[PDB]
C-alpha cells in the first residue's frame, strides 16, 4: 500500500534492551497463580499464597487446580492471558512451587498431575498413581512439577471443553509440616506457571479476559 | 519479492525472527 508520507525517513532505531520477538518468550517466564482465590483474598496479595501448617491427620490435601492454561485460576497468569489470545494450545507446562516457611521448618509434599477421565483425586493414594513429584523442602526452596503433554489430539482448546480438558493438579502432605520450638507452625507456599520447550499457541482470537463498555 | 511502491514502509509483513 502507498505511503502517505512519500520521502519520509524514520528516526534511527537505537538499541533498546529487552526486545521480544515471540509471545512464547513471555509464556516461558514464571508468573504467580492466584491458587487461593477465595472471596476474602481476590483483592489482595494473599490470593497468590497457599497455606501450609502442621497437620493432625496424615496425607491431607493442600490445594487443587485444573491445569488447562486459560481456565480459572490459571487464566489471569501471563501464560493464561497470552493463551486466551489463541484458540489452541499444546506442549508441556512447568508448575513451580516456592516454600516460604522458615529455614528451621521442614516439609515433604506430593504434587500430582492427574490426566482426564477420573475427575480430581479424592486422596493422596489416588493422586500418586498419576504423574507426580515428591518434593523435599530444603536449602533449595523451589520445586517444579512438569505437566507433560499427554493428549489424544496434537492440540487442546484454550476455552473449557469436556472433550479437550487437561486434568488436575493436586498437592498433598507427604509426611507433615514439622517445626522445632520458637518457629511458626504455619507457612505459605507460592505457586507459579510457565511453558516448557515444546509449548505453542496457534489460532489467534479476541481475548475473553478483557471487555469494553462505552 | 516485488515491491510496487518507492518506500520501505509500503511493503507487506516482514520475515520472521
Amino acid at each position: 500500500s502507498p505511503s502517505a508520507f512519500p520521502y519520509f525517513h524514520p528516526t534511527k532505531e537505537i538499541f533498546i534492551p529487552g526486545q521480544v520477538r515471540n509471545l512464547i518468550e513471555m509464556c516461558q517466564v514464571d508468573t504467580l497463580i492466584p491458587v487461593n482465590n477465595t472471596q476474602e483474598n481476590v483483592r489482595s496479595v494473599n490470593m497468590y499464597t497457599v497455606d501450609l501448617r502442621t497437620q493432625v491427620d496424615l496425607a491431607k490435601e493442600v490445594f487443587s487446580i485444573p491445569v488447562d492454561i486459560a481456565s480459572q485460576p490459571l487464566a489471569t497468569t501471563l501464560i493464561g492471558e497470552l493463551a486466551s489470545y489463541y484458540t489452541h494450545w499444546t506442549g508441556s507446562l512447568r508448575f513451580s512451587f516456592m516454600f516460604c516457611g522458615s529455614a528451621s521448618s521442614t516439609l515433604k509434599l506430593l504434587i500430582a498431575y492427574t490426566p482426564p477421565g477420573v475427575g480430581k483425586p479424592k486422596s493422596r493414594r489416588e493422586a500418586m498413581l498419576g504423574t507426580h513429584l515428591v518434593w523435599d523442602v530444603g536449602l533449595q526452596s523451589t520445586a517444579s512439577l512438569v505437566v507433560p503433554w499427554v493428549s489424544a489430539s496434537h492440540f487442546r482448546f484454550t476455552t473449557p471443553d469436556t472433550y479437550s480438558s487437561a486434568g488436575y493438579i493436586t498437592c498433598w502432605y507427604q509426611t507433615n509440616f514439622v517445626v522445632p520450638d520458637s518457629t511458626p507452625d504455619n507457612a505459605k507456599m507460592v505457586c507459579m506457571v510457565s511453558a516448557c520447550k515444546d509449548f505453542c499457541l496457534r489460532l489467534a482470537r479476541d481475548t475473553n479476559l478483557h471487555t469494553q463498555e462505552g | 519479492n516485488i515491491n510496487y511502491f518507492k518506500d520501505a514502509a509500503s511493503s507487506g509483513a516482514s520475515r520472521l525472527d
Binding site: 500500500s1 505511503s3 502517505a4 519520509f8 524514520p10 528516526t11 537505537i14 533498546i16 529487552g18 521480544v20 520477538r21 515471540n22 509471545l23 512464547i24 513471555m26 517466564v29 514464571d30 482465590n37 477465595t38 481476590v42 480459572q72 485460576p73 487464566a75 489471569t76 501471563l78 497470552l82 489470545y85 506442549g91 508441556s92 512447568r94 516456592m98 504423574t131 518434593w135 533449595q140 523451589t142 517444579s144 512438569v146 507433560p148 503433554w149 496434537h154 507460592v190 510457565s194 516448557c196 520447550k197 515444546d198 505453542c200 496457534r202 489467534a204 479476559l209 478483557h210 469494553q212 | 518506500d7 520501505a8 514502509a9 511493503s11 507487506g12 509483513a13 516482514s14 520475515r15 525472527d17
Partner: protein, 285 residues
C-alpha cells in the same frame, strides 16, 4: 538459500520447536526438579528430566506467536461520526459536514491491551477506512469524502470548506460510494526511536504538568469531511479507522491490563461508581 526461507514462510514453519528426546529412569545427585526461584530466573527443567519420555518429532511452529503475527492484524482504533444537513449553514459546521479525531491507539480496548503488553513499540501503520453512511431520507445523494491527516502544528479545519482542505502539503485520501476501502501506510513517525506505550514522566516540573505517554509524541489529527455540498437527504456517516502494525519491533514485556480502561493515555483504573469497585477477571471459588 532464500528459497528455503520462502518455502518455510508459505508452510508457516519458520519457527521450529524442539523434539522431545527419549528419556529413561535416573537415580542421581543431580536434581533438575529443585531450584531457587529467588534468583529471578525460571527453572530450566524440561519433561525429559522428570518423566520417562518417548521420542516425539515435534510438528508445532511458533510463527503465529511472533510479534508480527500477534500485532500485525487490522483492528478498529476510531469511529469518527458526523451527521450531514440539508441546511447550507449547518452543513458547514463540525459534527455535521466534517469531524476531527486526535490520533491514538488509546480509544479501543482490544488493540490498546495488545500493544500495552510492551513498554516500547516500533512499527509502520497500515490504515484502512470503512465508511458506512446511513441514509436518513429516500436517497443517499452523491457521497464523496476527504480524509486529511493534519500533522501537529498544521492548521485544523474549522469549517467544511475551509482553506485547509486544499491539502497543498498535508496527505489527503478521497473516497466515493462504491469505491473499495481506502488504504495507506503511515511510516514509523515518532521523534523518538520507538513509541512509548507507557512513560513514567512529565512535560514539566509543576503540579499542572501532564504525566504519561501523552507527553511523548503528538500524533496529529485525522479530519474527515463530506466534499459534497448540502443535499436534500441527510446521512449519519460513521468512518471506522482500522490499524495494522507492520515491520514490528517490541521491547520490555509487561503484565496485561487486568481491569477496565477508564481514560486515554492513563493507567487510571478506579471507576466513578460508589457501590462497584474496579473489577478483575479472577473468578472466586
Amino acid at each position: 538459500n532464500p528459497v528455503e526461507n520462502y518455502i518455510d514462510s508459505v508452510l508457516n514453519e519458520v519457527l521450529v520447536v524442539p523434539n522431545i528426546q527419549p528419556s529413561t529412569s535416573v537415580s542421581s545427585h543431580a536434581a533438575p526438579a529443585l531450584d531457587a526461584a529467588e534468583t529471578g530466573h525460571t527453572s530450566s527443567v524440561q519433561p525429559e528430566d522428570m518423566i520417562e519420555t518417548r521420542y516425539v518429532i515435534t510438528d508445532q511452529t511458533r510463527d503465529e506467536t511472533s510479534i508480527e503475527s500477534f500485532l500485525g492484524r487490522s483492528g478498529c482504533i476510531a469511529m469518527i461520526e458526523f451527521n450531514t444537513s440539508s441546511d447550507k449553514t449547518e452543513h458547514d459546521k463540525i459534527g455535521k459536514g466534517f469531524k476531527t479525531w486526535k490520533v491514538s491507539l488509546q480509544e479501543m480496548a482490544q488493540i490498546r491491551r495488545k500493544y500495552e503488553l510492551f513498554t516500547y513499540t516500533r512499527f509502520d501503520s497500515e490504515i484502512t477506512i470503512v465508511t458506512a453512511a446511513a441514509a436518513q431520507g429516500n436517497d443517499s445523494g452523491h457521497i464523496v469524502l476527504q480524509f486529511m491527516y493534519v500533522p501537529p502544528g498544521a492548521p485544523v479545519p474549522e469549517k467544511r470548506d475551509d482553506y485547509t482542505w486544499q491539502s497543498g502539503t498535508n496527505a489527503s485520501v478521497f473516497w466515493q460510494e462504491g469505491q473499495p476501502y481506502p488504504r495507506f501506510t503511515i511510516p514509523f513517525m515518532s521523534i523518538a526511536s520507538a513509541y512509548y506505550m507507557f512513560y513514567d514522566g512529565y512535560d514539566g516540573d509543576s503540579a499542572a504538568s501532564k504525566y504519561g505517554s501523552v507527553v511523548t509524541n503528538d500524533m496529529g489529527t485525522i479530519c474527515v469531511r463530506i466534499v459534497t455540498s448540502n443535499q436534500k437527504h441527510d446521512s449519519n456517516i460513521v468512518c471506522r479507522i482500522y490499524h495494522k502494525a507492520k515491520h514490528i519491533k517490541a521491547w520490555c514485556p509487561r503484565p496485561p491490563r487486568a481491569v477496565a480502561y477508564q481514560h486515554t493515555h492513563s493507567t487510571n483504573y478506579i471507576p466513578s461508581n460508589g457501590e462497584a469497585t474496579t473489577q478483575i477477571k479472577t473468578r472466586p471459588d
